[PDB]
């Protein structure tokens, strides 16, 4: 179902609506594109523009609040646009960070219309969209050099999300009505280089599963069982993948690992009966 040459500039992200019927591509050309996919067809609708620097990542909001797609660019700003009347418009612009923003994912509709922003400005922001338009932002420093990922943890307070460091550190953050904002929990060390990406699973089974990919060219699957329980570092393999590792994605169900390399190859992984990993 290829959509050959969607952009002019190299593409940095390919995400779909909750109903895999409409896509969203973003590139360096500072532009994002909306799509329609059927059997093998690709209808190109609008092309989102207002981004000064290369767009990095984008994320589809839950249909619960209509059609909304958020994008983050080098321009140190993340922007969201809705699709009222089949015509794409820019609803709000979030630019609190001072430097590139490399990741932006939406919170489980349960939580609400929340967006988690992680900038290379070393900080991270949490923003929910009220009514009138003016939101109440929440920012908290998260890493030394910077921040590269900010995946969320499923619903359960009890609001958690993992961060990937520019300083090689993976962290866990849980809300706190007494602290007024998300505070640190874990600080799982493991990578020798920078944490390129970290995604948290929705697999509600007995134990929690977290993925961490990095310039150190390895994935460390962080498995923990309960509050007490510490996270068990686990090398996806006791060798190095020839190139870096940029993305890690969790399948809806069946909990399978989508590990987008850098050697330009995508690999899939599963945890056999023991607790190790194998292809698919």
Residue numbers in the entry: 2 to 157, 169 to 292
Q: Which lines from the publication concern this structure?
A:
In eukaryotic cells, newly synthesized proteins are transported from the endoplasmic reticulum (ER) to the Golgi apparatus through the action of the coat protein complex II (COPII). Sar1 recruits heterodimers of Sec23 and Sec24 to the membrane, thereby forming the inner layer of the COPII coat. Sec23/24 is an adaptor complex: Sec24 binds transport cargo while Sec23 interacts with Sar1 and recruits Sec13/31. Sec13/31 heterotetramers constitute the outer coat layer, thought to polymerise into cages that enclose the budding membrane.
We incubated giant unilamellar vesicles (GUVs) with yeast COPII proteins (Sec12, Sar1, Sec23/24, Sec13/31) in the presence of a non-hydrolysable GTP analogue GMP-PNP. To understand the architecture of the Sec13/31 outer coat we applied reference free, contrast-transfer function (CTF) corrected, subtomogram averaging to solve the 3D structure of the vertex, and of the connecting rods to resolutions of ∼40 Å (and ‘Materials and methods’). The connecting rods are consistent in shape and size with Sec13/31 heterotetramers, and are bent in the middle by approximately 15°. This same bend is seen in the solved X-ray crystal structure, which can be fitted into the densities as a rigid body. In contrast, there is a 45° bend in the rods of in vitro-assembled protein cages. When we analysed the distribution of vertices and rods on the tubular membranes we found that they assembled regions of rhomboidal lattice.
